[PDB]
Design an enzyme around this catalytic site. Structure first.
Site, mmCIF file in Angstrom:
data_model
loop_
_atom_site.group_PDB
_atom_site.id
_atom_site.type_symbol
_atom_site.label_atom_id
_atom_site.label_comp_id
_atom_site.label_asym_id
_atom_site.label_seq_id
_atom_site.Cartn_x
_atom_site.Cartn_y
_atom_site.Cartn_z
ATOM 1 N N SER A 1 0.797 -1.226 0.000
ATOM 2 C CA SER A 1 0.000 0.000 0.000
ATOM 3 C C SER A 1 0.831 1.278 0.000
ATOM 4 O O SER A 1 0.258 2.347 -0.239
ATOM 5 C CB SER A 1 -0.970 0.028 1.187
ATOM 6 O OG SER A 1 -2.089 -0.797 0.926
ATOM 7 N N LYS B 1 0.299 3.341 -2.995
ATOM 8 C CA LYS B 1 -0.836 4.226 -3.183
ATOM 9 C C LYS B 1 -0.379 5.678 -3.339
ATOM 10 O O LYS B 1 -1.099 6.484 -3.922
ATOM 11 C CB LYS B 1 -1.855 4.070 -2.039
ATOM 12 C CG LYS B 1 -2.594 2.729 -2.125
ATOM 13 C CD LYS B 1 -3.692 2.552 -1.076
ATOM 14 C CE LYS B 1 -4.421 1.196 -1.263
ATOM 15 N NZ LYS B 1 -3.499 0.009 -1.099
ATOM 16 N N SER C 1 -6.260 2.245 3.285
ATOM 17 C CA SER C 1 -5.525 1.433 2.309
ATOM 18 C C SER C 1 -6.469 0.534 1.523
ATOM 19 O O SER C 1 -6.315 -0.690 1.477
ATOM 20 C CB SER C 1 -4.412 0.606 2.960
ATOM 21 O OG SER C 1 -3.668 1.357 3.907
ATOM 22 N N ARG D 1 4.708 -0.787 13.389
ATOM 23 C CA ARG D 1 5.334 0.064 12.378
ATOM 24 C C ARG D 1 5.441 1.497 12.877
ATOM 25 O O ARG D 1 6.524 2.097 12.853
ATOM 26 C CB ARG D 1 4.552 0.005 11.068
ATOM 27 C CG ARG D 1 4.408 -1.394 10.490
ATOM 28 C CD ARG D 1 3.400 -1.434 9.351
ATOM 29 N NE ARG D 1 2.039 -1.147 9.796
ATOM 30 C CZ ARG D 1 0.975 -1.153 9.002
ATOM 31 N NH1 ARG D 1 1.100 -1.459 7.712
ATOM 32 N NH2 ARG D 1 -0.219 -0.862 9.499
HETATM 33 C C1 HIW Z 1 -3.068 -6.854 2.444
HETATM 34 C C2 HIW Z 1 -2.740 -5.623 1.592
HETATM 35 O O1 HIW Z 1 -3.865 -5.238 0.850
HETATM 36 C C3 HIW Z 1 -2.292 -4.441 2.450
HETATM 37 C C4 HIW Z 1 -1.555 -3.485 1.522
HETATM 38 O O2 HIW Z 1 -2.045 -3.264 0.375
HETATM 39 O O3 HIW Z 1 -0.484 -2.911 1.875
HETATM 40 C C5 HIW Z 1 -3.480 -3.681 3.069
HETATM 41 C C6 HIW Z 1 -3.875 -4.238 4.436
HETATM 42 C C7 HIW Z 1 -3.435 -3.146 5.595
HETATM 43 S S1 HIW Z 1 -4.941 -2.278 6.175
HETATM 44 C C8 HIW Z 1 -5.988 -3.426 7.120
HETATM 45 C C9 HIW Z 1 -5.142 -4.253 8.084
HETATM 46 N N1 HIW Z 1 -4.993 -5.602 7.562
HETATM 47 C C10 HIW Z 1 -5.035 -6.638 8.409
HETATM 48 N N2 HIW Z 1 -5.204 -6.420 9.631
HETATM 49 C C11 HIW Z 1 -2.619 -2.334 4.820
HETATM 50 C C12 HIW Z 1 -1.695 -1.278 5.394
HETATM 51 O O4 HIW Z 1 -1.190 -1.428 6.528
HETATM 52 O O5 HIW Z 1 -1.441 -0.256 4.708
HETATM 53 N N3 HIW Z 1 -2.999 -2.331 3.383
#
Ligand code: HIW
Ligand code: HIW
Ligand code: CL
Length: 244
Positions: A49, A52, A97, A229
């Site tokens: 993400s 993004k 995200s 993080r």
């Molecule tokens: C799995 C991928 O889609 C991941 C990503 O694209 O980087 C999603 C999931 C988590 S947000 C929700 C938390 N997920 C689990 N607890 C996340 C982030 O931490 O930015 N984006």
């Protein structure tokens, strides 16, 4: 470029939480970089993400996203992350995200323009091999923590090859935390589809008289530790007297 000072004492912050990772810091005024692990600082991973940020910039510059208020309606498919199952704008899609919103952006951008823009951005290894709507999760694109910094510095200074407006909107959408001492503009990420699973946090801290860029990643076997993080990054930021 004076190089990167290594500061192994930050490893204590990872070890305290039974974790392994890297934090990279860049002092903009002094043009000095610091990391706990010079090797992992330069190791390139899937951006997940954190992609993004470039995806938003490209979508805005190509008019795929009109502004930060435009609503992208939920496609009605229930996914495992509850906050994804609703309508979103750019602000909330970044905050939560919301992958499916950005997958649709990617499809409308298209492989040819996505490739050319990442080359223009000098982003990571510039390789979009894989599905046009998932390559940053399970395709060929790889970026290291230090490469995130270089990219973020261009965005901060409005130097990327997109409009100033597009860069301002994305920096607005990156807003994560602010108080009377500092502003954090950042983006999280959680790379889960290819081993090793890692969590990202990249962005910067704005002070009155300086900006500190940061990029961290850490092993993330489960979602249980995603809060580490920000926690570990803030411990580094506080040790370095960047935030109180
Ligand atoms: C799995 C991928 O889609 C991941 C990503 O694209 O980087 C999603 C999931 C988590 S947000 C929700 C938390 N997920 C689990 N607890 C996340 C982030 O931490 O930015 N984006
Ligand atoms: C006052 C106008 O000139 C101004 C506006 O939005 O009204 C234009 C000028 C540049 S154009 C895009 C960047 N230029 C690249 N060569 C700009 C932008 O980068 O957002 N907007
Ligand atoms: Cl803002």
């Amino acid at each position: 470029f004076q190089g990167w000072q290594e500061n192994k004492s930050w490893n204590a912050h990872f070890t305290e939480h039974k974790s392994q990772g890297v934090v990279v810091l860049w002092n903009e005024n002094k043009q000095q970089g610091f990391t706990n692990n010079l090797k992992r600082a330069n190791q390139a991973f899937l951006p997940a993400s954190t992609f993004k940020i470039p995806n938003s910039l490209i979508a805005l510059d190509l008019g795929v996203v009109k502004d930060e208020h435009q609503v992208f309606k939920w496609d009605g498919q229930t996914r495992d992350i509850a906050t994804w199952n609703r309508d979103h704008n750019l602000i909330t899609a970044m905050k939560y995200s919301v992958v499916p919103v950005y997958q649709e952006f990617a499809r409308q951008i298209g492989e040819a323009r996505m490739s050319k823009m990442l080359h223009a951005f000098d982003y990571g290894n510039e390789d979009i091999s894989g599905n046009v709507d998932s390559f940053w999760l399970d395709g060929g694109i790889r970026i290291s923590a230090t490469e995130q910094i270089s990219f973020l510095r261009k965005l901060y200074h409005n130097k990327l090859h997109v409009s100033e407006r597009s860069q301002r909107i994305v920096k607005q959408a990156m807003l994560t935390e602010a108080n009377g001492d500092y502003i954090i503009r950042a983006k999280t990420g959680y790379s889960t589809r290819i081993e090793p699973k890692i969590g990202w946090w990249v962005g910067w801290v704005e002070l009155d008289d300086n900006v500190w860029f940061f990029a961290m990643n850490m092993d993330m076997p489960t979602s249980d530790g995603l809060g580490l993080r920000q926690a570990i990054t803030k411990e580094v930021l506080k040790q370095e007297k960047i935030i109180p």
